[PDB]
Design a protein around this nucleic acid. Structure first.
Lengths: 78, 92, 104, 97, 96, 108, 84, 99
DNA sequence: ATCAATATCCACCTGCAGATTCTACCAAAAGTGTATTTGGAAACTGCTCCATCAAAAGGCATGTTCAGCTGAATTCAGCTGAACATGCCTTTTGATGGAGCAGTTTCCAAATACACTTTGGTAGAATCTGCAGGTGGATATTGAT
DNA sequence: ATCAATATCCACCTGCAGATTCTACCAAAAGTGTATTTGGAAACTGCTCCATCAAAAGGCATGTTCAGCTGAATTCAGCTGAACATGCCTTTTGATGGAGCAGTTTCCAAATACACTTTGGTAGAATCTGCAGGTGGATATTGAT
C-alpha cells in the first residue's frame, strides 16, 4: 500500500518544501522514511490503545503518541 | 462532559479584535495551545518545587517557571501580567 | 464574584486551580498560583490571537482559521521559538524560496 | 506550440503549494497504508476518522520539514537537485539515524 | 548534625558482583550509574503517571509501569525488561 | 511479628523495592501506588543496570583494566545500538567519543 | 574585584583545534575559530541563564553542580556524572 | 634529512590520538574565567562550586565535539576535507539551533 | 531590449452552503465560611567550601616561514529529470445500515492508605592495591633515493 | 623496493591516591490491624466505525522530446599545515579568612478538608462569511525582429 503514496503526491510534498528539482531515486527513499515514521508513531499510538483495553485507536492516542515522539500536534485531541 | 477553554479564548478574542471571529478547527488549535502551555508551566513548576524540597507550588514557582520556558520579551510581559493579577487578587 | 473577576481576568482561576491539584504536580497548591498561571495563559492567548487577527485582516477574511495562526506564529521570532517543536494542523508553511533557485 | 522552459513550472508549483494547506496525499491510499501498518502490531483495530486525520497531518508536516532540510543540503553541495544522499545527510544530522 | 544523601551505590555494586565478580568500579563511574538509574526511574515513572492520567485512574500499578517500559524501551531491551518485571512481580505475589 | 525479610528479597532482586515505593509516592506521579509497581520498576532498573555493567565490564577486560571507569561505560553504550538509542540524548561525563574516522579522509 | 573582559579569547586556537580533532576533523578553515567561539558563547549563555535562574529561585548565591545539571536537562542535553 | 610529515598526516595522528582519550581539551582556568564573566552579566556577586564549573566544561566540550562531527559530515557532503563556517551554520540550521 | 503570442493568476462582483454564533436549559462544578494542622519563614550558629593569594615551574601557546595540495573556477557534454499532451483508473463522496463497541450505573470484592511503633544503608575511618608516570627498547608507521 | 627518523606501543616497575571493606548510629523500612475508595464485573444503550454500490471526475500513469544541470577533467592561486624558537600563563600546592550553606527549633500564614449551596457544556436554530464561478486585467513568459 506504500506504493499508494504516488510519485506526484511525494512531488507536491517536495514542492511545498521548497524543492525545485527532484532526483529519480528520491521517491523510493521517501517512502522508506515515511514508513519508519508511521511505524514508530503507530506502535506508540497502539500501545496507548492496548493499555486502555480498547480496540479503537482514537485521535487522542495518536496525539499522545506523537507527543512522546517530540512531534507535538495541535488541532485534534488537544 | 467535555471541558474546554473555548469560552475564554472567545472572550479574549472579543477584547483584542471585536471585529473578528474564529473557526472550529482554529479554536481546536487554541485549546491545544492552552493545554500544551499549561502542562509545560505546571510541569516545570513542579520540578522546581521538587528540587527545593517544598511540597507546595506557589505563584513564585509559577513565575520562575515562566522565566524558564518563555523566551525573553514574552517572559517579561507574562511575568508582568502575572504579578499584576496576583496583587489585584490579594488586595481582594 | 468569581475568583476570575476578583483578579481581573477572563481565564477561570477557579478551574486552573483544580486542574493543578488534580494534576499531580504537587501535594498542595498555594492560592496565588492558579491566578499567576491563568494570568500568563490569558496573556499568551491574547498575544497570539492578536497577531492572527492581523494575519486575517491582511488576507481579507474576517474569521481566523489555522493558516492565520501559523502565519502568526512563524512570522514572530519569539512565539516561533516558543512553539518551535509544535505543528499547527492545517497550517501549511511560510512562502519562502531560497535565493539560488530564482531564474537568472 | 507553447511550452515553459524546465524549472519554471517547478517554481510556479512551489509558490502555489507553499500558499495552501490542503493535504497533499490522496486520503484513501493513506488510510489504507495506516490500517496495514497498524495491523502488523495488533489485530482487528478500529480507527476514529480523526486518528487517521492526525496521522496524515503529522506525516505531511514531518516530510515537508524534511524536504526543507534536504534542499538546504542539496544547495550546500552546489546543486539544485535533491538526492537520497541528501535526505540521508539531513536525518543523520537531525538525530533520526 | 549529619545531612544524609541516599544513593543506589550499594545495589549497583551488588549487581556488579553478580555479572562480573572479577571487576571493580571507580567513584566517577558509580556516579554515572546513579545518574543513569535516576534518569531511567524518572522516565518510566513519568510515563506511567501520564498513563494513569489519560485513563482517569488515580493509582499507578505494575500494569502502568509495564506499558511505560514498552513505550520507553527499544525493542529487545523492552522484551527482556518486561520479562524480568512480570517474573519478579509474580515471585513477589506468591509471597515467593 | 515473625521474622521480616525485605520486599527486595521476597521478589528476588537486589534493588530496594522498599525505597522505590517511597520514591514513587513522594514523587507526585499519582495519588496512590499499587504494591506491584515498585517491584516491576525496581526489576526493570536492576535489569538495565545489569545489561550495561555487563557490557562495560567487557570493555574493561579488552582495555586490560580490572576496574570500570567512565570511558568504559561510554564504549559500552555507544557500541550497542539499543543502549545507544536509549541514551541517545545523554552525555557521559569523562566518556570521550568512539574512535571513528570517515573513510574519505584516509591517505590515498 | 577585577574587571572581566574578553575571556572568550582564552579558548585558544589549539584548544578549539583539539576539540575539532576528537570530532573527526582533519582540515580546519581559518574562520572556524571565530565562528566556534560564537557558538560556544551562545551555548554557555543559555545554560548559565537557566542555571542561574535555578540558583535565584533557591535564594542562594552559589550556583551548584545540581543547578547546572537541571539546567542542562531543560536544554535537552542531559548530563551524567555530577548531580545525578 | 631533515624530516617532516606531509600535510594531513599529523592530522590523522591527532584524530586517532584524541578520540582515544577523555581529558578535557580546553585549558581549565581560561574556561572558569569565561564562565564567571558570562554569569556576571546575569546576576552579580556569584559563587561557583568547583563542580558547577566542571559540569559546564564537560557539557560544552561534549557539545562542541558533537558539533564538529556533524560539521565534518557537512564538509564531506560538499566534496571537501576542510570544515568551514558555511558548514557549522548548515549543521546547526538542521539540528534546530538556528532554524 | 522590444514585439507579439499563450496561458497565468487575479481582482471585482455575485449566489449559497455548510458553519458561526446566538439562546434556552441544567447538572456538574465553583464558591464560601470555618476550623485546623502543618508546610515553610525567621533567626540563630555551627563549619563546609569558596575566592584569593603567594610561588615556582615547565607545558603549550604564539608568532613567523615554507611550499604542499586543497578549493575554487572554467570549460564541456552526457543523460537525466522536466514538461506535456494522451489514455486510463482509482479516489470521492454519499448516503444507508448493521453492529461491534466505547460509555454508564450499580454494586462489591480488591486493595491501599494510614497510624505509631527492627534492622538496612549511610557516614567516617582503616588497609590495600589497582594504576598513573617513568622508561627503554620492539614495532611499527612515514617519507626521502 | 629500501631503510633512516621517530613516534607509537607495549611490556616490566613502583609508590600513592582511591577503592574496598570495617565499625556504629539513626533514619527508615516493614508487620499489623483497620477505614475506605478504587477498580472491576456484568448487563444495556446510543454511537461511531466499517461496508458496500455506483458511478463520474478529476488525478495518475505513459511514452516522447530535449533543455540544462550535474559530474569530470584541469588550471592554479594561495590558504593552512608543519616545524622551531620564544616566553607567557596555566597548574599545583597550601594556606587561610569568611561568606553562606544548612542544622536545628520556634512559630505564623496558609491551604486542606468538609458541607453544601452559578458557571460553563449541550444542542437546537437564524443569519452570514466564504466557497465557487465567471470573466476581463495587466502579468509573466517565451518565442521571433
Amino acid at each position: 500500500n506504500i506504493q499508494g503514496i504516488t510519485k506526484p503526491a511525494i512531488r507536491r510534498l517536495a514542492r511545498r518544501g521548497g524543492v525545485k528539482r527532484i532526483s529519480g531515486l528520491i521517491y523510493e527513499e521517501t517512502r522508506g522514511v515515511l514508513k519508519v515514521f508511521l511505524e514508530n508513531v503507530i506502535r506508540d499510538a497502539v500501545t496507548y490503545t492496548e493499555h486502555a483495553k480498547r480496540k479503537t485507536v482514537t485521535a487522542m492516542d495518536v496525539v499522545y503518541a506523537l507527543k512522546r515522539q517530540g512531534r507535538t500536534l495541535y488541532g485534534f485531541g488537544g | 462532559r467535555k471541558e474546554s477553554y473555548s469560552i475564554y479564548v472567545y472572550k479574549v478574542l472579543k477584547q483584542v479584535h471585536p471585529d473578528t471571529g474564529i473557526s472550529s478547527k482554529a479554536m481546536g488549535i487554541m485549546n491545544s495551545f492552552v493545554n500544551d502551555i499549561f502542562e509545560r508551566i505546571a510541569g516545570e513548576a513542579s520540578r522546581l518545587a521538587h528540587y527545593n524540597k517544598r511540597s507546595t507550588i506557589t505563584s513564585r514557582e509559577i513565575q520562575t517557571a515562566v522565566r524558564l520556558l518563555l523566551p525573553g520579551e514574552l517572559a517579561k510581559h507574562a511575568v508582568s501580567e502575572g504579578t499584576k493579577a496576583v496583587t489585584k487578587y490579594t488586595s481582594a | 464574584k468569581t475568583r476570575s473577576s476578583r483578579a481581573g481576568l477572563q481565564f477561570p482561576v477557579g478551574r486552573v486551580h483544580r486542574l493543578l491539584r488534580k494534576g499531580n504536580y504537587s501535594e498542595r497548591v498555594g492560592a496565588g498560583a492558579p491566578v499567576y498561571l491563568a494570568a500568563v495563559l490569558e496573556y499568551l492567548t491574547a498575544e497570539i490571537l492578536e497577531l492572527a487577527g492581523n494575519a486575517a485582516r491582511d488576507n481579507k477574511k474576517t474569521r481566523i482559521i489555522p493558516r492565520h495562526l501559523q502565519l502568526a506564529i512563524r512570522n514572530d521570532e519569539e512565539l516561533n521559538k516558543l512553539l518551535g517543536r509544535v505543528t499547527i494542523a492545517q497550517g501549511g508553511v511560510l512562502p519562502n524560496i531560497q535565493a539560488v533557485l530564482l531564474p537568472k | 506550440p507553447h511550452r515553459y522552459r524546465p524549472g519554471t513550472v517547478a517554481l510556479r508549483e512551489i509558490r502555489r503549494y507553499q500558499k495552501s494547506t490542503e493535504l497533499l496525499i490522496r486520503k484513501l491510499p493513506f488510510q489504507r497504508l495506516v490500517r496495514e501498518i497498524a495491523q502488523d502490531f495488533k489485530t482487528d483495530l478500529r480507527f476514529q476518522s480523526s486518528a487517521v486525520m492526525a496521522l496524515q497531518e503529522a506525516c505531511e508536516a514531518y516530510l515537508v520539514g524534511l524536504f526543507e532540510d534536504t534542499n538546504l543540503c542539496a544547495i550546500h553541495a552546489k546543486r539544485v537537485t535533491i538526492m537520497p544522499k541528501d535526505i540521508q545527510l539531513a536525518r543523520r544530522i537531525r538525530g533520526e539515524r
